[PDB]
RNA sequence: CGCUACUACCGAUUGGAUGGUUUAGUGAGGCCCUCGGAUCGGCCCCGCCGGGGUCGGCCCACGGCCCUGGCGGAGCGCUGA
RNA sequence: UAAAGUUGCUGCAGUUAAAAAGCUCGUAGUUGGAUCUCUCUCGGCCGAAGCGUUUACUUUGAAAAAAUUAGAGUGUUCAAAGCAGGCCCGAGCCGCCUGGAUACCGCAGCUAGGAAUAAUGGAAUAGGACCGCGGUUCUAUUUUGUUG
RNA sequence: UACCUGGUUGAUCCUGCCAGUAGCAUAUGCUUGUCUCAAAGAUUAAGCCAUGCAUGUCUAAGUACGCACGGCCGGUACAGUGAAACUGCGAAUGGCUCAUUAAAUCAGUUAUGGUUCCUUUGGUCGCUCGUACUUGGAUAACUGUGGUAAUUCUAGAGCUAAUACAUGCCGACGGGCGCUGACCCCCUUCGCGGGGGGGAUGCGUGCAUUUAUCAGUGGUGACUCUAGAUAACCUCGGGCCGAUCGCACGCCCCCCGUGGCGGCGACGACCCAUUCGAACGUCUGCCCUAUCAACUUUCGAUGGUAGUCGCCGUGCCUACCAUGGUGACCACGGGUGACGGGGAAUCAGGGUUCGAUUCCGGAGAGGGAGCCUGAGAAACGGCUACCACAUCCAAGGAAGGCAGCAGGCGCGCAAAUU
């Protein structure tokens, strides 16, 4: 079938070579796993040595890490925005390694509000729900309030991430290969890389 | 700016450049810590690799490659590909019947790191063996020494 | 081939087995085990060709299936079991103990030992690595893995193992002045004292050895096995003390023995 | 130049021939993906046969609550293959 | 295959027997005149580190499948072969002694000495060696009994 | 054994071939008494095959209610031998041939710090804090009913097992450690404030898997190595954490029990190490041919970036890019009565020729191609198609691969017993 050998290629000088053996089992190849966005659907593949490869065909969730805060959380995947290799992958919404995607921001906001006890992602209208009020304005003792006030010194986030939190969606990059391991894992974009990808996305439109 | 020329972001994989810090340390300098390593066998790391800002995953000093095998030498003949040059190795082959020799040559495509600059055609290069980096490249430039006509 | 090979041609067998050409087409292919195929001695070869206990391969099986032979204190019924360097073979039925040691000709010799000596063996440290939970592990030349070794033991050293419990009793460090035997190459079977070690980064190291009579030679680092500390070995030696004679002096010794015979 | 024979060359022309390439147009079969659902079960709703406890009016009769073995019929109810 | 010094590297011919281009220039190739008599530091005289401007050459050493060839031993009745065999027995009823060597293995790649021959190298717009002395900028470790 | 002789002329000296001489290996002719070894359908046809055989396997230790045999008790599960069948393993080794193949194969030398690995050997296997005195449904062999001209074709019905197929606990289990932390104390302070402890209640936890971050036990010439810490994840086509078998059977208790404990093995299993390998790489090395001088790049040719696929490294493939790469030191193309070496014949010293052939590598099973199972095959004494041949038929269908051992046809100068 699909063979990824080296003897069907031309030589360095440019002349062609005559093969001396037919296709072998260990030189085989398999059709690509075009992973889309939807309810989870994964097929297992029996590979050389008796091992398994998890061929993810459909994925909708994955665990992403906020590196600056070191906060890893499991969040759903919403859409694909940018792809360096080819723009056809963006149109068909294919999940591959190093593609830029949009993920939900709710678990990160919950962790941030439970850690620093500061508002985040809230509108200027100051509308609130009592659960969030008791999460932020809880009655703490002197020692615990002392730790929280000290934590409030380091509570500061760049304007780009704050705007993304206001929008409700974050930009992330996938670091795992969905077609090989069956899961879509990655990290939240931030810093110079976030600016680079924002500029690329804006220029694409 | 000058480094970012591809559709994908060019980063050093082992360096985390998004570590948050106080506003006082941000004003000082935005100097990313450089990743480099000693390749061994007595070869020294060029200062341009340590102090440089280029990104090259195939660089023997700042990339993810391993130097093991044979260490060979050649003369630079062509510099027209991106980050890779063509060198020529000359030798003599012995013919038993006539008790004499004949001149022979080989051509090698080797990877040249951005840390090595001011490399001209006709200077000596010491290369080391690594894993296959492309279809025809299996060696990486380790040292560059100038020609006899250097002033 | 499409997979592992299961046969061994008799002419393609190792030459230190001293097999003859006209007996058959095949030779006993050693089973997988602690020792390499080219560096072991199969149980059948030692049991019928060296000791002359059996005449055919069937009698070797009839002996082995009575659970008479023990290798390193454990009963082996496989007739092609790979037995290698510094191994102990015990036959309780006849009350005999043997240790596999190369002679000066590079062949395994029938070397009888005291039953007291048959309780331990020497091993060469091949690998040192830290495993899960920060537990050191030591891997010897005969595939033995030992947990929690002495922190001073490094690679190329020698450890004494008690065959009953399989635990280290003591060890010898790889230093100049110790006693070593060559386990491979042109100097296989020679015993001497280490003189100096040459280090070649990225390549093989070369070690020089000098014997009792003053003859010097060199080998690679992988072919050296440390036997004893200083000039005193920790095991019993074969008839030849590890000194290789030249052809002229072997002829002289043979002629002297013939003259004194009769 | 006139006789007698052979080999090798041209060259009206088209046959018996095969072999090797490729341009285009079809294309068996396996494998992968998206569908598909012949059929086979398990769980709920009733009915009558059977064994363990208990509750109730109680005296060797009959119901309640659970389990438990089989059997017959529904639900395009649910689910698995 | 030798004979064939009738394919000539050793080692052939080219005036008249077959043969030197009509003549000249010229790139690649081949070839090329003489000359030049180990080192500080750090550690225990040696150990580490730089060696060598580098090679070519020669002499060592290591790694290099068996079988074949060469070759040691051995009365297969000799030999071609084979890797066998020999000794005393009053019987050893624990039988004894001994072999299964060695040489060679081209080229390329490793290792350590030699320094003749043959290549290559330095100080000429001296921004060349060696011993020192001031001026400025950028970072790391330790000592002020610890911690800022 | 470092070797020559006849032939051109009326006669001579030469150049120069022809012929003469000796080995070796194929055939053939004549002849042939005794013994020891010993090649043998390679050359033309990798052309075609009747027939027969060439791969099967059970221990005390997975499953026996076949009287098919068999000893005693006679409900008192199973005495023993054991056909058949389910399960497990092997069948990827060996044997044959040399068609293809010219930096390809192959040889020496290195590398995997860029991968996989049945089995053997050794190491782990209460390290997880959350019906068990043993859980469930079927299937053969067997007993009965059948279909087809025909096969190692199978269909229905009635039974019954597991180390087949599934499902699932207890125990260790007392806690420990990370975060959350109401509340309770102890110092200084007139007091706020500055400190030091204890803590109920909640979440997480072991090894493997995926991602992100932090610090820097042991090792290398060199890791983005090994080990450690932190936040999470952990695939229903699902990683581990034993519902398995045999032999000898014994010590203990407030006891006669739900009795508790215990020795050797067999089988199985996640993960390391080892063994047997396999697979991709580095350097050097191959016969003739210019009446083959430029080749490669539309359809990847050379390199870069990111991905896909793959067991891994890589134009292996994809997208976007640069214009590269090779060549009189002979590229590219063509031929080879070319599988490559270890080797063989002849040889003063050089050298010439051969190597299908018992050893080591490679390739193939009429020619192509695609696959299932499995640790390992693009397997052919496995399967599925096309191409060419070809067997039985009741014309509806079914079954093929001797370059395995014999043997047969054909081919030829040329090669053995069903
Ligand atoms: Mg082929
Ligand atoms: Mg010569
Ligand atoms: Mg085979
Ligand atoms: Mg075997
Ligand atoms: Mg199709
Ligand atoms: Mg000749
Ligand atoms: Mg001659
Ligand atoms: Mg001639
Ligand atoms: Mg001469
Ligand atoms: Mg002549
Ligand atoms: Mg003339
Ligand atoms: Mg002239
Ligand atoms: Mg010239
Ligand atoms: Mg000169
Ligand atoms: Mg060899
Ligand atoms: Mg040899
Ligand atoms: Mg005459
Ligand atoms: Mg002649
Ligand atoms: Mg007679
Ligand atoms: Mg034939
Ligand atoms: Mg043939
Ligand atoms: Mg034959
Ligand atoms: Mg056969
Ligand atoms: Mg079976
Ligand atoms: Mg199998
Ligand atoms: Mg045969
Ligand atoms: Mg090789
Ligand atoms: Mg790899
Ligand atoms: Mg294994
Ligand atoms: Mg049935
Ligand atoms: Mg099972
Ligand atoms: Mg780690
Ligand atoms: Mg890549
Ligand atoms: Mg690329
Ligand atoms: Mg040949
Ligand atoms: Mg051929
Ligand atoms: Mg000669
Ligand atoms: Mg001669
Ligand atoms: Mg040959
Ligand atoms: Mg051959
Ligand atoms: Mg042929
Ligand atoms: Mg094949
Ligand atoms: Mg065949
Ligand atoms: Mg055929
Ligand atoms: Mg076929
Ligand atoms: Mg298997
Ligand atoms: Mg096939
Ligand atoms: Mg066959
Ligand atoms: Mg076969
Ligand atoms: Mg036949
Ligand atoms: Mg047949
Ligand atoms: Mg004949
Ligand atoms: Mg005939």
mmCIF file of C-alpha atoms (C1' of nucleotides) and ligand atoms in Angstrom, chain F residues 347-351, ligand 37:
data_model
loop_
_atom_site.group_PDB
_atom_site.id
_atom_site.type_symbol
_atom_site.label_atom_id
_atom_site.label_comp_id
_atom_site.label_asym_id
_atom_site.label_seq_id
_atom_site.Cartn_x
_atom_site.Cartn_y
_atom_site.Cartn_z
ATOM 1 C "C1'" C F 347 51.884 -18.868 -12.372
ATOM 2 C "C1'" A F 348 60.297 -17.212 -11.786
ATOM 3 C "C1'" G F 349 59.100 -11.769 -9.933
ATOM 4 C "C1'" G F 350 54.717 -9.063 -11.986
ATOM 5 C "C1'" G F 351 50.113 -10.824 -13.791
HETATM 6 MG MG1 LIG G 37 53.456 -14.722 -9.454
#
